[PDB]
Curated annotation (Swiss-Prot), chain A:
This is ATR-interacting protein. Interacts with ATR. Heterodimer with ATR. The heterodimer binds the RPA complex and is then recruited to single-stranded DNA. Interacts with CEP164 (via N-terminus). Interacts with CINP. It comes from the Eukaryota. Phosphorylated by ATR. Belongs to the ATRIP family. It comes from Homo sapiens (Human). It is found in: Nucleus. Ubiquitous. The EEXXXDDL motif is required for the interaction with catalytic subunit PRKDC and its recruitment to sites of DNA damage. The gene is ATRIP. Required for checkpoint signaling after DNA damage. Required for ATR expression, possibly by stabilizing the protein.
Curated annotation (Swiss-Prot), chain B:
One of its GO terms (molecular function) is ATP binding. The chain holds residues 91 to 1114 of 2644 of the full protein. It comes from the Eukaryota. Ubiquitous, with highest expression in testis. It is found in: Nucleus; Chromosome; Nucleus envelope. Keywords: ATP-binding, Chromosome, Disease variant, DNA damage, DNA repair, DNA-binding, Dwarfism, Intellectual disability, Kinase, Manganese, Nucleotide-binding, Nucleus, Phosphoprotein, Repeat, Serine/threonine-protein kinase, Transferase. HEAT repeats lie at residues 586-620. This is Serine/threonine-protein kinase ATR. GO terms for cellular component: ATR-ATRIP complex; chromosome; Golgi apparatus; nuclear envelope; nucleoplasm; nucleus; PML body; site of DNA damage. Disulfide bonds: none annotated.
C-alpha cells in the first residue's frame, strides 16, 4: 500500500484523465466533466480530490483497497455529476432534446461507471457508497431507479458497479443492498441485452454472496426471483450475445451455478425445471463442441466450460433424485449429452 | 459432525503432515500430498457439492492465513516464530507453494465467483512477496488462475503493477533467475496480449501505458541487448510481437508519436542484431513496414542504412561480418520483397525495394567469403549462409536479378552436390546436410526453366538421384516445380512415388501439395507459385519462401488416388484433398467411389477429413452405389457393434444428408431414421443432431418441408415400422412399445401435438399400411386405432377411400387383388355401393397419378365401373 496504493489511486485518476476510459466515449473528464456553479466547484474539488488521491493511497475488504479522502470527496462530486444524470432520469420518470439530455446523463453515467471503477480502485469512495444516504447512497438509490428506467449498457455498467460494490460491501451491507436485484431481475428482460444480462449474472453471483439474495431461493418457481431468472437463462435466447460472448454469458451462469453449488444451503422450482432446460442448452453447446471434436483459446475456454458444464450436470443428477424425470424432458438431448459426455471424456486428458 | 470427526482424524494426521511438508524429500512428497489433497477436495466434492464448498471455505481460510503470512512478508517486519512448533517463512513458503499447486487446480475446480479476484490479487501480492523461483512458482499458479479469470477487475492497477514488476525484473534479471523464471508464465502473459486487438483492445489503455513502460523496459532499456536466457529473449520478442506488433487500440496511446518513440525503441530493440528473436523482431519490423505501407500511400532508408552497416561489416571482411549478422542482413529480404511494389500491389510503387544487384554484390562477396572460410569455419554457418542464399532466392521471388546470378545461385546451391543439378561449375563444387540438400533442392525447384533449364531438369534428376528425409520431400516438390510447363502438363510424378506409392510420410505430404495442384486446382499451371501471402510461421523456420484460375478424372488422378489408402497412414487427407476438398466420370467415378468408400470406411473415425470434403464431392448412380457401399459399411458397423465405429458412420451419414440435395441422401437420412429407431444409445439422439444439421443445410419449412421430406420416404419409414409391426413380439404392450416408437417418430416430426402430427400422418399411414396389407400390420393398425382411441374401424372406412387411392397409386396386379381380398377380409362387407358412392376425389387421386398411373389409372376407371356394377 502506501505510495504504491497512492499510485494505484493516481492510476484510477489517470484512467479518469484518459479520454475516454469508458467505452464509446471520445473524452472522459475535462470538457466531458464540465447549482451548476456548485457542481463546477464540486468538479474542482474532485480535481483536488484526485490530486489528494494521488498524494495519499476482511472479506468485505477482500484484496486490500487504497482509501483516499480525496477519492471519497471526488465520489461526492461524482455523486453530484451522477445527480445530474439522475435528474435526467428523474425528468424521464416525470415524463409520461430529452434524448440529448439522456445522452449527457449517459456520459455522466459513463463517468459514474469510470467513478465506479475508481470506487473499485479506492476503498474510501466505496466506503462513502457503503455509508449511503444513511446503506444505499442517495445518488446510488437514484441510480438504482435510473437503472430500472446505451442506457441499457449504462444499466449494465451500474449492475457491474453494483457487483464491484457488493464485493467491497460487507455481507450484511450486501444483504441490505440485496433485494434491489429482485426489482432489477424484474427490470432484466430477454429483450434487454445479453451482455447486460451477463453483467446481471455477475451481479447475481455477488448477490449469491449477499445473505438477503441467499435468502431468496429457486424454490416457489416463477414467484421466486431466482427461478424466474433461471427460466430466462434456460431459454438462453442470447440474441445480443454472439459466438464466444454467448458462451461467456453461459460460462458466467455456470460460475454462478458453481457458487450456488459451493454454498451449503444451495416444478416446485422453475429454476430446477430451467436447470434441465439449461443442461439441454449446455448439451446443445456440448453437441457443438462434439461437432468441433481446443487450439483456439476460446475453444480451450469452451472445453473448460464444457468440463464445468459436465460437473454441473453431474451435480444436477446428484441434486435431483428424479434425475430421470428431468432427463425425460431433455432425453433426446440426453442421448446427445451422453455422446457429448463420451466426447468430453475423450476431450479430457 | 461425524464428517467433522473424520476431518479431526485428518487434523491429527495434519500435525504429522506439517513435519512432512518441509523435508529434503518433502517437496516431492508434498506434490503427492497436494495431489492427495486435490483428490480429498474432489472426494469432498464427490461427498457433496456443499462438502466441497465447506472444504473450499477451509481452503480459503488457509489461503487467508497464507495471505496474512504473505502480508507479514510484504511488511518485512514482525515474523511469528510459530505459524501453525517452529515455523520458517521459506519452509512455510515451500509448503504454501505445494498448497498453491493443489489450490490452483482446486481454484479452477472451484470456479468461485466474486471470491477469486481478491485471491488473484493476493497471489499477485504473494508474487511480489515471492523471490526468484518461489515467485516464479507463484507466478505460474497465478498465470493459470489468470487464464481462467482473464484479467481481474479487482487486481486492477496491482495486476498492471505486477506486469510492471515483471518488466522491472526483465530489466535486471539474473540468468539463474531467468532459469528460475518460467517462460510459460511469460508466454501466458504473451498469450494474454491478443495477436490482433481482441482482449488487448478490451485491455485497459492504462494497462497499455504500463505495457509502454514495459516497452521502455527490456529492449528500449537495452536489458534485451544485455545477455538474456534465449527462451526469455524469445518470450520478450514474443511479447513485443504480442503487443507492440499487434498495436491494438492505442488511440488513447501516443500512436504515431508513440511509434516514433517505438521506432527509437526499435533501434534499441535491434541492439546487437546480427552483430530467431531478431527474426521475430524482423517480423515485427516487417509488421512496422506493413504499418508504414498504405499509411505512406496517399524509415525504409534508415532500415537500408542499418542493412548497409551490416553490409559494411561484410564488406570489410567475410570474417568481419558476423554469421548471425550475415543471417540478419538476409533476414527481412523477403519482407523487403513484400515491401514497396509487392506492398503497392497489395500500384504507384513509389517506395523502392533495396536493389537485388547490391545484395548480389554482397552475395558474390559472401560466395568469396565461403571460399575464404576454413573447413572449421562455415559448415553450419555455411548452412546459415545457404539459408541466407535461400532468403536471397525468396528476395528474388518472382524474378531472379540476373539469369547469370540465378546460374551462380544454382552453382552455390550445388556446392556439396556433385554433377546432376556457373563458370566455376564443378571446380566450385570441388572447392565446396540432407536438410541443406533439401534447401538446395527447394532453391533448384524455386528456379524454373529460364537459364539452366536443362540444369533444373538435371536438378530434378538429382532430386530423383537422392531422396532422403527432407531432401526426399523436397525432391517430390522439386519434380513438380522443375518445369512450369511440366506442371501445366499432366503426367505421373513417378520417381519416389513410383518407388513407394506412399513414397514415405515426408514425400506423402509433398504428394499432398502436388495433389493440391491436382483435382479441382487446374492441371494447367498459371503463376504456379505456392508462395501465396506467407506471414510468420509461428516459431517455425521460414524455410521455403512459398480447373482453378483457368473436371479432373479420378482415373486421371490414377496412382496418386490409388496411393491414398486406409493402409496408408493418412490422418488426414489434408493438402491431398486440397481444392477438391474445398460429370460423366464413369470408370473414373467408380475409382472416385472406391476412394470415397475408403473415406467412408475411415481408417480413423476422427479423420472422417471426409466431412466437408464429402460436401464438396456432393457439390461435384455411382454415388448411389457408393451410398449403398456406405450402407454396407453401416451394416458392417452394426456387425462390428462398436459405438465409435457406429458414431463415425452416423456422423458420415449426417454429413451426407446435409451435403446432398438429392433424395438418395434423404433416403440415407431415412436409413439414419431407422438407425435412430435402433436402441443402444446414439441412434436418434445422434440422429436428431444429424437431422438438425441436415435441417440447417435444408433451410427446412419443418412440417411442410417434412411432407416433401416424407411422402414415399415416410412410406419407407412406415415400411420400417411395418417391419417392426411384422415382428412386434410383450403382446399389447409390445404393440404399445411399437406405438411409442411411432410416437417418437411423431415427436421427431414435431408438428403441433406429436399425436396431432401423427394423426395427419396416420391417414397417409393407414393407406400405406393397407398397401402393405400385412396381417401383423393390420393387427398393428387396430392397435394404432386403439392408441388413437378415435373412430378406428369407422375411421378405417374413411381411411379405406384414401387406401383405395393408395391401392390405385401402387398396383400389385393379381397380388394387389389378393391384397385387396386381404383388405376385403378387414373390410368385411366393405364400401360396396358406398365405394361407387365415393370414388370422386379418391378417383381423382388415381387421376392425379395420371401417366405414372398410366394403364392402371385406365384400369382403375374400369375397376370403378366394376365397383359401380371403362376399358
Amino acid at each position: 500500500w502506501r505510495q504504491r496504493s497512492n499510485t494505484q489511486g493516481s492510476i484510477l485518476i489517470n484512467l479518469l484523465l484518459k479520454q475516454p476510459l469508458i467505452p464509446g466515449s471520445s473524452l472522459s473528464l475535462c470538457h466531458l466533466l464540465s447549482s451548476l456553479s456548485a457542481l463546477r466547484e464540486a468538479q474542482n474539488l474532485a480535481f483536488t480530490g484526485l490530486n489528494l488521491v494521488a498524494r495519499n493511497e476482511g472479506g468485505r475488504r477482500a484484496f486490500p483497497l487504497c482509501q483516499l479522502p480525496g477519492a471519497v470527496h471526488f465520489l461526492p462530486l461524482v455523486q453530484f455529476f451522477i445527480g445530474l444524470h439522475c435528474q435526467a432520469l428523474q425528468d424521464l420518470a416525470a415524463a409520461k432534446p430529452e434524448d440529448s439530455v439522456c445522452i449527457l446523463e449517459g456520459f455522466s453515467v459513463t463517468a459514474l461507471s469510470i467513478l465506479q471503477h475508481l470506487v473499485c480502485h479506492s476503498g474510501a469512495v466505496v466506503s462513502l457508497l457503503l455509508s449511503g444516504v444513511g446503506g444505499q447512497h442517495p445518488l446510488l438509490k437514484m441510480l438504482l431507479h435510473l437503472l430500472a428506467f446505451l442506457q441499457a449498457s449504462v444499466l449494465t455498467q451500474c449492475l457491474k458497479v453494483l457487483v464491484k460494490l457488493a464485493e467491497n460491501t460487507s455481507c450484511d451491507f450486501l444483504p441490505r443492498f440485496q433485494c434491489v436485484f429482485q426489482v432489477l431481475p424484474k427490470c432484466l428482460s430477454p429483450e434487454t441485452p445479453l451482455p447486460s444480462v451477463l453483467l446481471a449474472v455477475e451481479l447475481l453471483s455477488l448477490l449469491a454472496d449477499h445473505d438477503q439474495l441467499a435468502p431468496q431461493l429457486c424454490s416457489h418457481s416463477e414467484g421466486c426471483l431466482l427461478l424466474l431468472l433461471y427460466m430466462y437463462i434456460t431459454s438462453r435466447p442470447d440474441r445480443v450475445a454472439l459466438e464466444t460472448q454467448w458462451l461467456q454469458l453461459e460460462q458466467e451462469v455456470v460460475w454462478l451455478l458453481a457458487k450456488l453449488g459451493v454454498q451449503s444451503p444451495l416444478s416446485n422450482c422453475q429454476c430446477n425445471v430451467e436447470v434441465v432446460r439449461a443442461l439441454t442448452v449446455m448439451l446443445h453447446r456440448q453437441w457443438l463442441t462434439v461437432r468441433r471434436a481446443p487450439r483456439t483459446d476460446q475453444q480451450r475456454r469452451t472445453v473448460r466450460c464444457l468440463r464445468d458444464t459436465v460437473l454441473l450436470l453431474h451435480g444436477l443428477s446428484q441434486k435431483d433424485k428424479l434425475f430421470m424425470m428431468h432427463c425425460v424432458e431433455v432425453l433426446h438431448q440426453f442421448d446427445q449429452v451422453m455422446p457429448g459426455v463420451s466426447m468430453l471424456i475423450r476431450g479430457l486428458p | 459432525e461425524a464428517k467433522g470427526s473424520c476431518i479431526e482424524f485428518s487434523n491429527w494426521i495434519i500435525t504429522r503432515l506439517l513435519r512432512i511438508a518441509a523435508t529434503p524429500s518433502c517437496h516431492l512428497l508434498h506434490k503427492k500430498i497436494c495431489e492427495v489433497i486435490c483428490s480429498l477436495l474432489f472426494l469432498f466434492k464427490s461427498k457433496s457439492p456443499a462438502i466441497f464448498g465447506v472444504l473450499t471455505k477451509e481452503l480459503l481460510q488457509l489461503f487467508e492465513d497464507l495471505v496474512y503470512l504473505h502480508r507479514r512478508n510484504v511488511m518485512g517486519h514482525a515474523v511469528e516464530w510459530p505459524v501453525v512448533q517452529l515455523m520458517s517463512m521459506q519452509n512455510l513458503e515451500f509448503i504454501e507453494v505445494t498448497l498453491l499447486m493443489v489450490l490452483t487446480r482446486i481454484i479452477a475446480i472451484v470456479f468461485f465467483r466474486r471470491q477469486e479476484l481478491l485471491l488473484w490479487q493476493i497471489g499477485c501480492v504473494l508474487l511480489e512477496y515471492g523471490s526468484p523461483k518461489i515467485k516464479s512458482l507463484a507466478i505460474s499458479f497465478l498465470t493459470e488462475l489468470f487464464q481462467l479469470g482473464g484479467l481481474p477487475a479487482q487486481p486492477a492497477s496491482t495486476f498492471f503493477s505486477s506486469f510492471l514488476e515483471l518488466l522491472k525484473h526483465l530489466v535486471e534479471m539474473d540468468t539463474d533467475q531467468l532459469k528460475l523464471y518460467e517462460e510459460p508464465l511469460s508466454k501466458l502473459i504473451k498469450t494474454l496480449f491478443p495477436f490482433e486487438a481482441e482482449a488487448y483492445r478490451n485491455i485497459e489503455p492504462v494497462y497499455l501505458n504500463m505495457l509502454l513502460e514495459k516497452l521502455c523496459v527490456m529492449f528500449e532499456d537495452g536489458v534485451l541487448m544485455r545477455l538474456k536466457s534465449d527462451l526469455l529473449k524469445a518470450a520478450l520478442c514474443h511479447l513485443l510481437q504480442y503487443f507492440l506488433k499487434f498495436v491494438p487500440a492505442g488511440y488513447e496511446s501516443a500512436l504515431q508519436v508513440r511509434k516514433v518513440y517505438v521506432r527509437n525503441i526499435c533501434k534499441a530493440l535491434l541492439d546487437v542484431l546480427g552483430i530467431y528473436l531478431l527474426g521475430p523482431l524482423y517480423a515485427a519490423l516487417k509488421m512496422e513496414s506493413m504499418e508504414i505501407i498504405e499509411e505512406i500511400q496517399c524509415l525504409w532508408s534508415a532500415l537500408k542504412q542499418k542493412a548497409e552497416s551490416l553490409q559494411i561489416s561484410l564488406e570489410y571482411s567475410g570474417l568481419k561480418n558476423p554469421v548471425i549478422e550475415m543471417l540478419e542482413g538476409i533476414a527481412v529480404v523477403l519482407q523487403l520483397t513484400a515491401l514497396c511494389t509487392v506492398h503497392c500491389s497489395h500500384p504507384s510503387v513509389v517506395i523502392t525495394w533495396m536493389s537485388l544487384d547490391f545484395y548480389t554484390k554482397v552475395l558474390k562477396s559472401c560466395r568469396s567469403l565461403l571460399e575464404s572460410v576454413q573447413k572449421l569455419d562455415l559448415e553450419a554457418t555455411i548452412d546459415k549462409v545457404v539459408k541466407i542464399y535461400d532468403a536471397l532466392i525468396y528476395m528474388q521471388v518472382n524474378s531472379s536479378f540476373e539469369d547469370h546470378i540465378l546460374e551462380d545461385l544454382c552453382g552455390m546451391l550445388s556446392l556439396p552436390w556433385i554433377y546432376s543439378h556457373t563458370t566455376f561449375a564443378a571446380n566450385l563444387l570441388t572447392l565446396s546436410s540432407p536438410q541443406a540438400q533439401s534447401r538446395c533442392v527447394f532453391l533448384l525447384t524455386l528456379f524454373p526453366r529460364r537459364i539452366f533449364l536443362e540444369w533444373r531438369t538435371a536438378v530434378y534428376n538429382w532430386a530423383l538421384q537422392s531422396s532422403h528425409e527432407v531432401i526426399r520431400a523436397s525432391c517430390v516438390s522439386g519434380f513438380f516445380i522443375l518445369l512450369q510447363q511440366q506442371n501445366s502438363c499432366n503426367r505421373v510424378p513417378k520417381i519416389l512415388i513410383d518407388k513407394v506409392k506412399d513414397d514415405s510420410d515426408i514425400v506423402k505430404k509433398e504428394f499432398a501439395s502436388i495433389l493440391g495442384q491436382l483435382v479441382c486446382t487446374l492441371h494447367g499451371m498459371f503463376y504456379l507459385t505456392s508462395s501465396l501471402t506467407e506471414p510468420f510461421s509461428e516459431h517455425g523456420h521460414v524455410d521455403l519462401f512459398c480447373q482453378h484460375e483457368c473436371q479432373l478424372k479420378a482415373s486421371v488422378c490414377k496412382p496418386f488416388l490409388f496411393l491414398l489408402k486406409k493402409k496408408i497412414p493418412s490422418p488426414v487427407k489434408l493438402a491431398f484433398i486440397d481444392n477438391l476438398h474445398h460429370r460423366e466420370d464413369e470408370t473414373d467415378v467408380k475409382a472416385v467411389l472406391g476412394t470415397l468408400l475408403n473415406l467412408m470406411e475411415d481408417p480413423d473415425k476422427d479423420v472422417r477429413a471426409f466431412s466437408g470434403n464429402i460436401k464438396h464431392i456432393l457439390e461435384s448412380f455411382i454415388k448411389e452405389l457408393f451410398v449403398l457401399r456406405m450402407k454396407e459399411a453401416y451394416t458392417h458397423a452394426q456387425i462390428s457393434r462398436n459405438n465409435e465405429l457406429k458414431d463415425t458412420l452416423i456422423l458420415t451419414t449426417g454429413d451426407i444428408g446435409r451435403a446432398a440435395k438429392g433424395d438418395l441422401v434423404p433416403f440415407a437420412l431415412l436409413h439414419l431414421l431407422h438407425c435412430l429407431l435402433s436402441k443402444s444409445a446414439s441412434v436418434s439422439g445422434a440422429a436428431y443432431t444429424e437431422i438438425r444439421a441436415l435441417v440447417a443445410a435444408k433451410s427446412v419449412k419443418l412440417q411442410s418441408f417434412f411432407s416433401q421430406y416424407k411422402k414415399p420416404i415416410c412410406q419407407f419409414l412406415v415400411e420400417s415400422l411395418h417391419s417392426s409391426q411384422m415382428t412386434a413380439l410383450d403382446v399389447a404392450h409390445q404393440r404399445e412399445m411399437a406405438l411409442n416408437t411411432l410416437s417418437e417418430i411423431a415427436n421427431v416430426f414435431d408438428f403441433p401435438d406429436l399425436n396431432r402430427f401423427l394423426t395427419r400422418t396416420l391417414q397417409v399411414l393407414l393407406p400405406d399400411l393397407a398397401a402393405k396389407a400385412s396381417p401383423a400390420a393390420s393387427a398393428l393398425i387396430r392397435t394404432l386405432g386403439k392408441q388413437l382411441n378415435v373412430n378406428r374401424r369407422e375411421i378405417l372406412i374413411n381411411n379405406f377411400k384414401y387406401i383405395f387411392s393408395h391401392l390405385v397409386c401402387s398396383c400389385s396386379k393379381d397380388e394387389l387383388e389378393r391384397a385387396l381380398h386381404y383388405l376385403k377380409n378387414e373390410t368385411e362387407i366393405e364400401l360396396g355401393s358406398l365405394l361407387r358412392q365415393d370414388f370422386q376425389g379418391l378417383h381423382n387421386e388415381l387421376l392425379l397419378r395420371i401417366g405414372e398411373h398410366y394403364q392402371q389409372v385406365f384400369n382403375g376407371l374400369s375397376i370403378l365401373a366394376s365397383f359401380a356394377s371403362i376399358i
